[PDB]
Structures are given as structure tokens and as C-alpha cells.
């Protein structure tokens, strides 16, 4: 049970799965910064990145592909750099783990 | 096949083919490259078996 | 994202449950290992019903390795127990 | 019952005589040494063959046979022909009326 | 590879491991009912003992046609195809 | 020695024809039992065992033919294909009836389909938002 | 194994049908390799 | 069946797992003649026990694996560290 | 060459029921000591019951057959080399007359064996003339 | 033995990132532990 | 053409010379090689000599006729070992092959009809002369009276077409179109009997069994294809009326394919089961012919070509067990893997060709036929799956029960396999996998 | 070989050496990956509590 079960009991309290931010992004008055891409579209499509992996930090994935192709097939030689790409995803996950949560707070303040 | 084991012949042949296919598979992961060859049999109604 | 994927996911998880219960109640060696093959098929078809080709392919290669290893083990044990595939007759093979 | 044991004993004597005939005829060295292939003459095999081939001589048009020939053959043929004609007429009136577009019709053979 | 002496040793070993049979009275030609005191279900226990010992299945007609240990030796040697 | 010589004949209306047909098929008179007088039913051929197949018959009996489990000059059953050892035969009689097996299988299937498709819109989820993908028209923000 | 490679390297549905029929037929034959009615019934089941 | 033994070798009282069944049958008031046919089946020398077989099976190469792991650690600190 | 007779006695019926009951008990209880304990329990169950009459014995034999049909294991243990086992008749031996249809150059690979076969053929034809001739 | 780490570095050009709580990451390990301690000792048989 | 016809006409005096049985099949394979050389054909009629010409459908059918007759002389060595009438057998085979070449290379409908119904008299002669059964009289009379009873009113239909049009040529009759029920029934029902239906089949399983091996080759190899060729020539000017009345024949053929595929599971003869097996595949051919698509016509031509080889090759396999085991019964034919292990390669290679097989031309004919029938209606997906499943449910039964299991006890000593038989079943299977290469030859006759 | 009511014939040195070698190989692989990568069994990345974050930053 858990996060689905409360969605059966209190649907107006708990937001749905993979919910977009319904309210204003500037409602919390942080004036929070804008995520700016380092790698643009043409070198994203030059590296044959799939559409499910074109995140806000795809330059680290491009550098991971470059270091994998630099020491192929023994790609563990810069294995920690993989973790670097991984922790960027973790940072994005942390942002997602905030982007849901304050939304529930934004759905609690109106309740 | 005479004076020899057909199992040993098949064993050495399939280790050689498996090593060749493995070394081909490592080259096809470095480039993310897909090949698709096509041999026509019969064409009718713009559809080719 | 299809009703085909939903139905295939249900039937793949159901054959996982079927294979686990059947191999827990099966008294034949090679039939237990064929039920283990069924359980791994349920695992791969349910993870591709989620939609993960690389996970399905990785578990496919892994299952092929260890399951050919199990069947070679079972064949050697059956060939020394003289064609008796019943798991009740076999016993204590760790010493022998 | 005492009548059962006599019947089983008589059947066993007949089976023993037929078994002795089979052991005489199956290992015949002269019949093997002729070189022409064949089988030991079994009556039940020929009875089974003529049972499987000839069956019109015991056939009469009764109600049970008519029910079997209706529900086994003619009724699936009639239902399948009715279904095919109904589906093709329903598609053909839509095709001839003009309710389907040119680029939205199934089986263009393209 | 087996032998008649080995199979005879198998049969007398299994029949002398039975506590309802005295090993002094036990013999290769000893009858299972007239010479030795055995129940109708005791001979079935002897038959399944020979089945578990020799690793095959003995039918019921061949169970009731065995009355001596030498008959069991002749039945086993005919099934497993040894005569020397 | 052909199919016209050895063949099933007319139905035994009288008892002497039944005795002659029993002696013709190498069967004792008590064992012989012809078919019905309906349109499909055979005439003069014996009705053999339709209880259970060839696997039910004794494999430890010394047969003249170990394959098909029959002796010499024994009348082959009319549905010998359907009651063969290969198809639709059991060595032991089944423990349950025919409908119990299918009833339990479709009962478990109906329960599993029902309980799955009731819960198809109660999938769980982590405390996570939608996956943000970059677009030239819509921009997204970080938390720092 | 050759029929299995003919199934793997094929993206065409007709050639997957080629490898499919090859896998089914040689799998049925290798099941019925042993000469008894159990292998007969097993081959009939794995063929259908 | 080479060098078959006699019935005087097999004794019920040597093994615990069969004299437990004999004691349970004596408590129930029954006797059994086929215990001496299964004395060889439980042998502590030829076949071992349950606890020795588990330690043989689960930890067959744990000491050799730990020695090789110490060797890998010792050669890794000389080069990697 | 004693062909078995199809009549089965009542003592043969209860002996077959005892054998099949202990085989089902061996299938249900895999450990040998537990199977031995339950086998002595079933033997005592038979031995307390053997003093009755014939009609009551027939009715209770039918009841025991119904009980054994009720408690029958779904995977009964059978010997592999016997009939009905897991590996019964895995190879089929053709009769020896196909050895008479070999090529003479193929027959030259085992000339002592084929000479002994040709010697044994005359003994077999005199034995067949003695037996069935 | 080597086909786990030999293919995990090869079949994944982009590794999946896992951020899970303490009761779900080792949940499959705890289920494997209770299945190992459950599927063995239940099959142990004693008298009575 | 006239070269092949005059080649067979001057091969006629080879029969009257003593000890000349094996030279005739040598010259028949030589003229099959020459016919392999003359392959400059397109969809229209080429090599026009008087009333004789050839297009691609006619080329494939004459080449199949020459291959089946050349293997038919190779299969019948039982006629040569005995003093059975070799000269009459060779004359009947040459005359029948000449009539098949003349009825396939016919430019017009009437000469096609004339040599088409001239062909059934040598088949009658082979069935009543060289068979090994007391019911050869029941075999030939059923065949002749079925085909004659339904083919006599086709002559009235043929001259009604001649009186309405004027010509007999196929191309000039392709221009016209008729809207009559009885003309359609006359010009269709003779071919609807000549290829097996469900209702009209009876002559087939009672004429294949009691014939010789050569009657089995000529019946299941090329004379179930005379009706297919006739319908391929007649359907072009009867399109409107066959579109009205084709659902009855297609439904009857599909349900009859399912039912006859259920019959073969209850068959105890090897030669009867292939006889009913010819009914099931030609049911798919008949169901794909009446949809009038490009794919249905092309896949029908491909499946008739690929079926005339495989059914004849299966009928040679049932003959080489009938010559040795003494009977065609399926109970006797058991465990031939331990008797003839090298034959079991050809049994499974020709039984797999009867179903869908990976390298055979039968799959390329079956794929292009199921395309048209699924395109015809969606309800046919229920019964094409049942028919194509039951086809290998029964076809694996003949190989499984004849070539696997315990041996039949009480069988006397017979001879081993021969190089002629291995060559005979070699040439029934290597054309089935060498013709997927250059398959645009044997498929695109349009 | 055949054995009756006894153990097997005594094993060669090669089988015992191979058994200890493959057991040492498996356990060396397990303990080596335990020492070099202990983070894979647990959470490789930390999971902070969603109820721990302050409401004064966004809310
Ligand atoms: C041509 C001249 C140049 C090539 C050459 O030197 O050929 C060797 C050839 C003679 O070699 P060989 O020993 O006779 O080879 C055949 C064996 O006798 C075959 O004897 P075997 O008993 O070893 O047969 C095993 C069988 C099984 O062998 C195989 O299946 C061959 C597998 C390896 C070759 C695969 C070819 C395709 C590779 C694609 C990548 O081999 C074949 O079937 C051989 C033909 C294989 C297809 C071609 O000629 C010379 O040496 C000079 C003349
Ligand atoms: C047996 C020969 C084939 C019979 C079935 C095929 C046939 O005639 O179909 C036409 C038709 C198929 O029906 P249908 O599709 O023409 O019916 C349409 C009906 N309305 C207009 C109301 C929608 O067959 C029949 O109607 C009768 C079928 C056979 C009945 C029993 C015959 C016994 C002889
Ligand atoms: C059914 C058998 C009797 C049919 C009688 C009617 C025929 C007739 O007159 O048609 C004239 C009609 C019309 O002829 P018409 O177009 O020349 O009309 C000219 C007008 N009159 C006659 C006034 C001068 O013919 C046709 O529609 C074309 C068919 C011609 C050939 C007819 C053959 C009759 C036999 C049919 C058999 C069908 C089944 C065959 C297989 C089974 C055999 C058992
Ligand atoms: C009725 C049967 C009568 C007797 C037929 C006897 C066999 C004739 C076969 C003729 C077709 C043929 O083989 O064509 C060769 C074919 C003709 O094809 P092709 O080489 O012309 O290729 C173009 C044709 N399409 C477009 C169909 C691909 O040759 C090949 O395909 C060459 C490679 C053959 C494959 C390897 C074979 C083993 C070495
Ligand atoms: C079944 C497989 C049959 C063989 C298939 C081989 C193949 O597809 O090779 C093609 C590939 C092309 O690679 P490449 O030439 O770099 O790309 C085009 C730009 N020049 O060429 C290569 O991959 C060539 C490099 C092969 C490396 C591994 C060799 C293993 C041993 C072979 C002997
Ligand atoms: C919900 C559950 C759905 C289950 C669907 C199962 C479909 C059929 C699977 C194959 C069954 C079969 O034929 O098994 C092989 C068997 C071999 O013999 P066996 O019975 O195993 O031996 C014991 C002693 N007789 O064979 C036989 O005994 C008979 C051999 C001939 C079989 C003929 C074909 C019958 C198939 C079943 C009918 C349904 C067909 C559906 C087709 C759908 C196509 C899309
Ligand atoms: C083989 C053994 C193997 O692959 O072991 C796995 C290993 C990585 O082990 P792991 O513990 O994950 O990482 C160590 C620290 N990160 O290593 C790897 O994952 C390495 C990559 C997979 C194995 C590559 C095998 C290469 C085979 C030969 C290629 C030859 C290329 C041409 C010659 C080059 C000569 C320099
Ligand atoms: C040998 C096998 C020979 C088979 C010959 C079959 C000949 C009959 C064909 C029947 C047929 O096609 O009938 C079509 C006809 C409906 O045709 P249609 O004009 O489209 O319908 C009018 C819609 N308002 O439908 C009808 O007229 C209905 C026919 C009913 C027949 C009943 C028979 C009872 C016995
Ligand atoms: C597991 C399932 C087991 C099913 C039943 C097993 C235990 C049930 C108790 C016994 C079952 C019976 O029916 S015992 C046969 C009944 N007859 C008698 O014993 C009464 C007297 N009849 C006799 O002739 C007896 O001597 C015997 C035991 C039948 C003959 O054997 P021995 O010659 O004594």
C-alpha cells in the first residue's frame, strides 16, 4: 500500500503520479534560478543520445561516452566519472523529489 | 569426421564463431552502429518478400 | 503503453507465481529446473512489459549462462544416479 | 462368480493357442529366408482395415445420422457462409456508398 | 558387470537382514511359507525389498510366482541378463 | 486375402449369426458385443473396450505385439486411433472429474484478471514529479 | 543452433517465420530423438 | 556389489536416527524388521552428518577466497595506493 | 514359459493394495525413517484387521481401494529403469536380420562375428525344426 | 562468474540512477534471506 | 512450342524396343533440361507455333509435368523387375505426358478441354492396370464418372462462350464479361471437382489408395492442377458473377479444409492420409483463387507448383514402405527410424514441405495465399489459424507414427534402401528449395 | 565405478583442488567486490526525508 492508498482515501490531499506543477512556479517568491543547458541540440544529436536521456545535464553523459570510447572495452578506468553523471541524475531526482513535495505543501496551504 | 570427434570439430568451430561474433559485438557497441542488409526474392504490388 | 503490455505484464507475473509454487511442489530435478526457466521467463517478460529492453537483454544473457550451467549439473548428477530424475532418491551429493 | 473363472480360463487357452501360432510364424526361418518382406498374417489387422475403408454398407438415413450430419458439417458451413456474406455486404455497402476515404481504407495491397 | 555369485550374495544379504527370518533356517532352497513362517503381507515386504535393492519393479504375478530365494536369483538374473 | 474377403458383414439379428460373428473375430461369444442399429453405427464388428486407453492395459503382460498392446488374431477396436497410447489415454484413472480442473483454472484466472484490472489505476509512485525535459518554448527552474 | 541464428539476425517477419519454423521443427526432432511414447507425446506437445 | 558385507556389521544402536524410530515404535508397542537394511544409509565416516555437509557445501572455498582477497588487498596497496 | 493368468485372488488383491499403499506412502514421505515409521503403522493397521470374514473383507477392501484412490500422490515415485518410469526403453534394438542385409565389404569388418552368426544359423534352423517343425 | 560485471559495463552506455529508501533497496535481499531460511528448514523433516 | 511435342512423339518408338526402360527417363530428363533452357517467357503468350504457345503459368506447369513424369519413370522399378508390361507402361506415360504438355501449352479454351479430358484415359489405364488392389474398379470409375459428369456441361458452356464471343483464344475472351448463373456453374464446377472440394472430393481418397505409385504421382502431382489452370483461365471473364457466388465456395473450402484436416488424425493408412492431405492444401488454393487479388493468384500458382512436388514425394515415401512392409496400414508402419534411418531424412524433409517449412516454396505459396484470404474478410482469421494449425497437427502424425517408436513385431526380412530411391526423393525436395532462388519466375505469371 | 552400501572410491587430488579453487574464486570475487564497492548493496545515493525540509524556503 502507501502512496497509492492515500490517493484512494484523500485524493485532494495527495497529488497524482508524475504530476506537473499545477500552481505558479514563482508563487513561493524564491525568484529561483533557471536551469541552463551546456550542450545544445546539434552536439546532442551528433552523439546519438536517445530521447529518454536528453536531460538538463547531457554534457556529462557526452563526456562519459567520450571516456568510454577512449578506453574501450575497458571502460572502468574512469568509472567514477560514471558516478559523476549518476549524481547529476541524483541531483535532478532531488529536484524532482522537491518538485512533488512542495506541491503537496502548496496543495495543503489551500486546504 | 573420420578418425576424429565430430563433437570436438563442432566445439572448435563454435568457439571460433563465438569469439568472432563477440569481437564483432564489441566493435558495434563503440559506434552504436546498426547494419541492415537486404536480399530481394520477389517483388509485386510494390511489396518485396 | 498498451493493453497488450498490461495483459502481458499480468500473465508474466502470473507465470512467475505459477513457476515458484510449482517448483516448490515439484519432486523432479529437471522439471524443477524447467520451472525455474518459466520463472525467469516471467521476470524478463514483465520487465519488458514495463518497457526496458536493456534490462530484459541483460537478464536474458545472464539466465542463459546460469541455466545452461544448472542443466549441465543436473545431467551429470542424473548420469551418475543412472537416469533417476526423482529428487527423493537423490541425496547428500556434496560429499560424493 | 464361478462362471467368470471358466470364461477367463477358456480365453487364456485361446490366447495360449494364438500365442503359440505367433511364436511359430514370427520366427519362421524359411519365410525370413525367402527375402520378400511382409508381416505375419493377423486377422484383426485386416478386419480393422476393412472396418476403416468400408462403412457405407452399414449406413441408413436415420434421425441420429441426420442430426450428426447437420450439426457436424452443414451447420458450421452455413453459419460461416452467412457470417462471411454479412461482413462482406456490410463492408461493400460502405465501399459503394462512399463513407470511407481514399487514404483511410484497409488492405490497399501497398 | 554382475555375476551369479554376487546376485546370490545380494539375495541372501537382504533376506538375512530381515528380523522375522532366522538366519540359521535360511537357505537358497528354503520355501517362504512351508519352511519359514511368513505372512501373506511379509512376502510383499520381501518383494519390495528386492525392488528397492535391485532397482526395478516386480509385477504381482511375478511376485506370487517367487517362493524361494533361488527363484529370486533366477528372476533377477533373467531380467538383468547375466548367466555367468 | 483382401478387404473384400475379411470385412464386417450384416448385423446379427439372430443368435446363431451372433455366435458365428463371435467365432469369426477370434472372440469368445460372451465377450462379443456388436454396435447399435443406428445410421452411424457399424454392423457385425465387435465393440471393444472404450473405458480407458492402451496405457490402462497391462504393460507387464507378455504380449505378442508389445507395441499397440495386443496379441495375434485379436480384434482391434474401431476407435483405435482415439483410444491409442499416444492420444487421450491415461495409465491410472484421473483423481477428479473433467469439469473440476477447468473450473479451478478459470476460477483462478477470473479472480486474477478481476483483481488486477480493478487495481489498474491504483499504481503506486515515489514522491516524484513529472520528468522535466528541455523545450525552446517552456523553461524550467532549479531550487538553488 | 543455425536456425536460432537465422531467427536472431532477421528483422523481417518472413525470415523470423523461417527461423521460427526451423526452431520448432528441429526442437520437435530433438525431443523425439529418444525412442519411446513419452518422447512421442512430448514432441507432439512441443510441436503444436 | 564388490566385497559385500555381512549382517553382523549393521547394528541399529550405532545410529541415533533409527534408534529414535525404534524407541518411538517401542513406545507405541510395535517392532520393525527392516531397520538393519538402512544402517549403512546413515554413516558418519562414509557419508558424514547434516552439519558437516552444510559447512562443506556453503563454505567450500571461504578460506581460500579470504586468502586470495588478502593477497589482492596486499598487491593493490603496493600499486594502486 | 508360464503366461500369467488373469484371475486375481482376494489375498492377491489385498497384497496388491498393501504394495500400492506402501508405494504411495514412500512417494508421500521422502525421508526413509519417517517412511519406515509410517510403514510399520500401516502394517499394524493391516495386522489388526486380518481376522475378519470374507464379505466384510471384500467391502473393506473396496473401502481401502477408495481411500488409496483418494490419497494418491500427484507425482508417484517410480523406478526409472522399469516400465512407466522416467527413462524406460530409451533405445530400441532392431532385430538381427538387418545384420544379414549388410554389404559384404561392410561384412568384412567383422568376419569372425559373421562366421559365428552363419554357424549359429544352422543351429537355429535345426532348433526351430525340433521345436515347431 | 565473470558475466555479471563483464556485461554491466558493456550493455549500459547510460546507467540507471537509483534513489530508494532503506526499506526498499535491501528489500529484495531481506526477501532472499527469509526465502533461504524458509525454503531449507521447512524441508527438514523430523518424527511426529 | 513444337520441339518438346515432337521430342515426345519421336520418343514414342522407344517403348517397342526391348530393354529400353531406362533410356526413356534419361531422354525425359534431357528434355526437362532443354525445357529449363527455353525460358524467355513473360505474362503474355510466347513461342507461338500454330495453336501452341506458352506463358509463365504454362511454363511452370509444363516443367512440373515433365519433372513429375521423369520421376514417375524413376519411381516405378517394380514394373521393371517383374515382367509387367513395360512397353505399354512407357507408351501410356509418354502419351499422358504429351497430353499434359498439349493441354498446358494450349492457346485456346477448346484444345485445353480436349487434351484435358484426353488425359484421364491414361490415368484410367494406369489405375486399372498397374495397381495392387481388388478395388481398382471402384477407383477408376469414381474418378472418370465424377470428372465426366461435371465436365460434360462445361462443353455446352464453352460453346456458349464461343457463340457469344466468336473466338476461342484466352486473350480475346479476357475482354468479354458474362452475367449468367448457369454459364458460371458450367465453366466452374468441372474445375471445382478436378481440384478437391470438401463435398466433391470422394474420387480422390478412393482413387489415390487403390492406384499404383505412378497413378499417385500423376493424380496428386499434376491432375489436381488441371482444375487450377482451368480456373486461372476461366475466372478472368466471370468476375462479376464469381464475386456474387464465391463466398459459398470459399466458406465450404475453408470449413472443409478444417474438417479434412480433422479426418487425417483418424486415418490408418499412409497413402490415404496424403490423399486427404491433398484436399486441405488445395482448399487453401481454392479459397485464395476466388478472391481475384494479385497475391491470391500468384500464391495459388506458387502453392500448386510447390504442392505437386511435395505430395508426389510423400507418395513415393509411402510406396517404399509398402514394397517392404507389405501393407499401407499405419499400425504396421512403426519405428522405421531403426529400419531405414537414412530414409527418415527424406520423410521429415518431405513431411515438413507439406506444412510451412523454412526453405521451401510451399511457405512462399502459403504466405501469399493467407494474405489474400485475410484481406478478403476478417472472419477468415479464425478458421485459417485452425486450418494451418491442424495441417501440422496431422502432417506431423504421419512422420511421427511411421518413423518413431517401438518396432512392429512379426515383420519379415526385407531389403534395405537403394540409391535410386534416395535419388528419387532427392529430386522431390531440392526443387522445393532451389526455386525460392529465382522465385519471381515461379510466382509472377501476371 | 560401482559401490555397494558404502561411500564412493576416494577422489583424486585434481577434483579436490578444483573444488577448492572454484570456491576460492567465487568467494574471492564476492569479498573483493564487497571491499571495493560496498555501496551497491545499500543505497548508492542517500534518500533524505521529504518531511525534513523547511517550509520557509518554498511554501
Ligand atoms: C578451394 C581452394 C582454396 C581453399 C582451400 O584450401 O580449400 C581446402 C581444400 C581441401 O581441403 P579439405 O581438407 O579437403 O577440406 C574438406 C574436408 O575434406 C572435409 O572433411 P571433414 O570430414 O573434415 O568434413 C567436415 C565438414 C564440416 O566442415 C564444415 O562445416 C566447415 C566449417 C568451416 C568452413 C566454413 C566456411 C564459411 C565461413 C564463413 C565465415 O567439412 C565440409 O563439409 C567441407 C565443406 C564445407 C563447406 C564449404 O583444397 C586445398 O587444400 C587445395 C586444393
Ligand atoms: C450442403 C451445401 C452447402 C449449404 C450451405 C451453403 C449455402 O448454400 O449457403 C447459402 C445460404 C447462406 O445463407 P445466406 O447468407 O444466404 O442468408 C442470408 C439471410 N438474410 C438475408 C436473412 C440475412 O444457405 C442457407 O441459407 C441454407 C444453408 C443450408 C441449410 C441446410 C441444407 C441441407 C442440404
Ligand atoms: C441444371 C441443368 C439444367 C439446366 C437447364 C437450363 C439451361 C439453359 O437453357 O440455359 C439457357 C441460358 C440462356 O441462353 P442464351 O443466353 O443463349 O439465351 C438465348 C435466348 N433463347 C434461349 C430464348 C434463344 O444459358 C445461359 O445462361 C448460359 C449457359 C449455357 C449452357 C447451359 C448448360 C445447362 C446445364 C447446366 C449445368 C450446371 C451444373 C453443372 C455441373 C453439375 C452437373 C450435374
Ligand atoms: C519443377 C522443378 C523442375 C526442376 C528444377 C530443377 C532446379 C532448378 C533451379 C533453378 C533456380 C536456381 O537455382 O536459380 C539460381 C539462383 C538465381 O538467382 P540469381 O542469381 O539470378 O539472382 C537474381 C534473382 N532474384 C531476384 C530472385 C534474387 O542463383 C542464386 O540465387 C545464386 C546463389 C545461390 C545460393 C547458394 C546455393 C548453394 C551454393
Ligand atoms: C554474422 C556476422 C558476419 C560478419 C559481419 C561483419 C561485418 O558486418 O563487418 C562490417 C564492419 C564494418 O565496419 P567499418 O568498416 O568500420 O564501417 C564502415 C566504415 N568503413 O567491419 C567490421 O566490423 C570489421 C572489424 C572486425 C573486428 C573483429 C574481428 C574478429 C575476427 C574476424 C576474423
Ligand atoms: C485456457 C487453456 C488453453 C490451452 C490450449 C491448448 C491447445 C492445445 C495444445 C496441444 C495439445 C496436444 O495435442 O498435446 C499433445 C498430445 C500428445 O499426447 P499426450 O496427450 O501428451 O500424451 C498422454 C497420453 N495421451 O497430443 C494428443 O494427445 C493428441 C494429438 C492430436 C492433437 C490434435 C490437435 C488438438 C489441439 C487442441 C484443440 C484446440 C486447438 C486450438 C487452435 C488455435 C489456433 C490459433
Ligand atoms: C573479463 C573479466 C571482466 O570483465 O571483469 C569485470 C571487470 C570490471 O570489474 P569491476 O569490479 O566491475 O570493476 C573494477 C573496479 N571498477 O572488467 C570489465 O568490465 C572490462 C570490460 C569487459 C571485458 C572486456 C574483454 C576484452 C576481451 C579482449 C579484447 C581485445 C581487444 C584488442 C586487443 C587490445 C590489447 C590492449
Ligand atoms: C456442391 C455444392 C453446390 C453449392 C451451390 C450453392 C448455390 C446457392 C447459392 C446461394 C446464394 O449465394 O444465395 C445468395 C442469396 C442472397 O443474394 P443477394 O441477392 O445478395 O441477397 C438479396 C438481398 N436483399 O441468398 C439466398 O437466396 C438465400 C438462399 C437460401 C437457401 C436455403 C436452402 C435450404 C435447404
Ligand atoms: C494409503 C491408503 C491405504 C488404504 C487402506 C489401507 C489400510 C486400511 C486397512 C486394511 C484395508 C483392508 O481392506 S484389509 C482387507 C480386508 N480383509 C481382511 O483383512 C479380513 C480377513 N480377510 C483376509 O483374508 C485377510 O487374511 C487378508 C489380510 C485380506 C489376507 O491377507 P493375509 O493372508 O492375512
UniProtKB/Swiss-Prot annotation, chain E:
The modification O-(pantetheine 4'-phosphoryl)serine is found at residue 40. It is found in: Mitochondrion. One of its GO terms (biological process) is [2Fe-2S] cluster assembly. GO terms for cellular component: mitochondrial [2Fe-2S] assembly complex; mitochondrial inner membrane; mitochondrion; respiratory chain complex I. It comes from the Eukaryota. Its main location: mitochondrion. GO terms for molecular function: acyl binding; acyl carrier activity; structural molecule activity. Keywords: Electron transport, Fatty acid biosynthesis, Fatty acid metabolism, Lipid biosynthesis, Lipid metabolism, Mitochondrion, Phosphopantetheine, Phosphoprotein, Respiratory chain, Transit peptide, Transport. Residues 5-80 form the Carrier domain. Carrier of the growing fatty acid chain in fatty acid biosynthesis. Accessory and non-catalytic subunit of the mitochondrial membrane respiratory chain NADH dehydrogenase (Complex I), which functions in the transfer of electrons from NADH to the respiratory chain. Belongs to the acyl carrier protein (ACP) family. Complex I is composed of about 45 different subunits. This is Acyl carrier protein, mitochondrial. The gene is ND-ACP. The chain holds residues 69 to 152 of 152 of the full protein.
